[PDB]
Design a protein around this motif. Sequence first.
Motif, PDB file in Angstrom:
ATOM      1  N   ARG A   1       7.122   1.447  10.383  1.00 39.67           N
ATOM      2  CA  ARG A   1       6.360   0.568  11.266  1.00 39.67           C
ATOM      3  C   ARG A   1       6.518  -0.903  10.922  1.00 39.67           C
ATOM      4  NH1 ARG A   1       1.102   0.991  12.178  1.00 39.67           N
ATOM      5  NH2 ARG A   1       0.692  -0.280  10.312  1.00 39.67           N
TER       6      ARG A   1
ATOM      7  N   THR B   1       7.786  -0.301   5.693  1.00 35.27           N
ATOM      8  CA  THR B   1       7.596   0.990   6.354  1.00 35.27           C
ATOM      9  C   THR B   1       8.398   1.073   7.645  1.00 35.27           C
ATOM     10  OG1 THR B   1       5.569   0.121   7.357  1.00 35.27           O
ATOM     11  CG2 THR B   1       5.340   1.553   5.436  1.00 35.27           C
TER      12      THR B   1
ATOM     13  N   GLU C   1     -13.792  -1.510  -4.494  1.00 32.63           N
ATOM     14  CA  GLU C   1     -13.127  -2.781  -4.234  1.00 32.63           C
ATOM     15  C   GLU C   1     -14.136  -3.907  -4.086  1.00 32.63           C
ATOM     16  OE1 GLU C   1     -11.080  -2.152  -0.705  1.00 32.63           O
ATOM     17  OE2 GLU C   1      -9.528  -0.801  -1.500  1.00 32.63           O
TER      18      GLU C   1
ATOM     19  N   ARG D   1      -5.083  -7.181   4.488  1.00 34.66           N
ATOM     20  CA  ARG D   1      -5.091  -6.837   5.915  1.00 34.66           C
ATOM     21  C   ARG D   1      -6.461  -7.071   6.572  1.00 34.66           C
ATOM     22  NH1 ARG D   1      -2.622  -1.022   5.111  1.00 34.66           N
ATOM     23  NH2 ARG D   1      -4.305  -1.003   3.535  1.00 34.66           N
TER      24      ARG D   1
ATOM     25  N   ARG E   1      -1.074 -14.383   4.959  1.00 33.17           N
ATOM     26  CA  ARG E   1      -1.751 -13.554   3.969  1.00 33.17           C
ATOM     27  C   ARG E   1      -1.217 -13.836   2.574  1.00 33.17           C
ATOM     28  NH1 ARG E   1      -1.762  -8.277   8.072  1.00 33.17           N
ATOM     29  NH2 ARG E   1      -3.732  -8.934   9.051  1.00 33.17           N
TER      30      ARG E   1
ATOM     31  N   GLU F   1      -1.586   5.448   8.027  1.00 31.39           N
ATOM     32  CA  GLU F   1      -2.013   4.174   7.462  1.00 31.39           C
ATOM     33  C   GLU F   1      -2.234   3.128   8.535  1.00 31.39           C
ATOM     34  OE1 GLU F   1       0.092   1.095   6.682  1.00 31.39           O
ATOM     35  OE2 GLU F   1       1.975   1.777   7.591  1.00 31.39           O
TER      36      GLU F   1
ATOM     37  N   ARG G   1      -9.510  -1.619   8.532  1.00 34.38           N
ATOM     38  CA  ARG G   1      -9.586  -2.737   7.608  1.00 34.38           C
ATOM     39  C   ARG G   1      -9.632  -4.059   8.353  1.00 34.38           C
ATOM     40  NH1 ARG G   1      -7.964  -0.569   1.948  1.00 34.38           N
ATOM     41  NH2 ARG G   1      -9.380  -2.041   0.923  1.00 34.38           N
ATOM     42  N   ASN G   2      -8.790  -4.198   9.362  1.00 34.57           N
ATOM     43  CA  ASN G   2      -8.640  -5.474  10.030  1.00 34.57           C
ATOM     44  C   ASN G   2      -9.642  -5.676  11.162  1.00 34.57           C
ATOM     45  OD1 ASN G   2      -7.352  -7.963  10.549  1.00 34.57           O
ATOM     46  ND2 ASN G   2      -6.223  -6.981  12.234  1.00 34.57           N
TER      47      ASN G   2
ATOM     48  N   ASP H   1      -5.650  -6.347  -1.232  1.00 35.89           N
ATOM     49  CA  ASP H   1      -5.389  -5.979   0.151  1.00 35.89           C
ATOM     50  C   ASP H   1      -5.712  -7.164   1.036  1.00 35.89           C
ATOM     51  OD1 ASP H   1      -5.386  -4.688   2.807  1.00 35.89           O
ATOM     52  OD2 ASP H   1      -5.403  -2.810   1.676  1.00 35.89           O
TER      53      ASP H   1
ATOM     54  N   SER I   1       5.354  -2.500   8.092  1.00 39.14           N
ATOM     55  CA  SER I   1       4.334  -3.075   7.226  1.00 39.14           C
ATOM     56  C   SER I   1       4.921  -3.242   5.826  1.00 39.14           C
ATOM     57  CB  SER I   1       3.061  -2.212   7.192  1.00 39.14           C
ATOM     58  OG  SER I   1       3.303  -0.881   6.757  1.00 39.14           O
TER      59      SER I   1
ATOM     60  N   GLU J   1      -5.336   0.354   8.652  1.00 39.94           N
ATOM     61  CA  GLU J   1      -5.137  -1.064   8.941  1.00 39.94           C
ATOM     62  C   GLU J   1      -6.163  -1.561   9.957  1.00 39.94           C
ATOM     63  OE1 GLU J   1      -1.025  -2.352  10.000  1.00 39.94           O
ATOM     64  OE2 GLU J   1      -1.678  -4.442   9.646  1.00 39.94           O
TER      65      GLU J   1
ATOM     66  N   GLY K   1       0.221  -5.426   5.086  1.00 42.40           N
ATOM     67  CA  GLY K   1       0.271  -4.788   6.382  1.00 42.40           C
ATOM     68  C   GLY K   1       1.390  -5.348   7.230  1.00 42.40           C
ATOM     69  N   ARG K   2       1.069  -5.607   8.486  1.00 39.60           N
ATOM     70  CA  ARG K   2       2.067  -5.976   9.465  1.00 39.60           C
ATOM     71  C   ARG K   2       1.903  -7.385  10.004  1.00 39.60           C
ATOM     72  NH1 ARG K   2       2.083  -3.260  14.108  1.00 39.60           N
ATOM     73  NH2 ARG K   2       0.727  -1.713  13.070  1.00 39.60           N
ATOM     74  N   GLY K   3       0.769  -8.031   9.765  1.00 40.09           N
ATOM     75  CA  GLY K   3       0.434  -9.268  10.439  1.00 40.09           C
ATOM     76  C   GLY K   3       1.240 -10.453   9.966  1.00 40.09           C
TER      77      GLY K   3
END
Lengths: 203, 24
Positions: A139, A137, B19, A190, A162, B2, B9-10, A188, A141, B6, A155-157
Amino acid sequence: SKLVLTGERHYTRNDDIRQSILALGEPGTFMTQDVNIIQTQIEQRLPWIKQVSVRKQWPDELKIHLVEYVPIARWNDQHMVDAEGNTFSVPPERTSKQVLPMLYGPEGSANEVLQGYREMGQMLAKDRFTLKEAAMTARRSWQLTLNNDIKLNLGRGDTMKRLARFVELYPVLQQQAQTDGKRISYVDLRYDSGAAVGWAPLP
Amino acid sequence: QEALEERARNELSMTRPGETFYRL
């Protein structure tokens, strides 16, 4: 005037070259034109050509040698990128039955995406998972698509921690989907140290 | 957009109906 066309050609066909020429001179021919404009015209009408050289050889000959870009992945969807991060495109009538990995990113990020695709593919390869898709993205991610069609949301971490968690957890997710007659649709990652799994019925 | 999901979620350990969650 004879026109001699050389090089390894996977996408170009001969009418691509002759059209570039006639569309500049006339229905008549070409000799003491400027070789540098014949070269520039071909670079601009054929965006998959990485290098073209145009050279007058007497008696009476114009010799054109072509080097094409070679794709290692579709870029976004309608374009393509090579192993050095170069961006190009090929008329899709000529690529519609190829099967390549799929990268996505913002408009100048091919190299960055391709780098992340390389690094993450390396790690998944150590456990015999293979990467079919990779999207980044604005951003920065990441979402990945395995060859078995499971999507992974990183995500971004720390994307590599992960990634390792997926591989550790995978045998129970597979036993669980085995037990309920479902298939894993996505995982997922994140979270701090967990994973949310979405299921799907078996095809 | 989004970004919100995040953090949702985080930061809080939130999911989406349907889920399964696993905690290690």
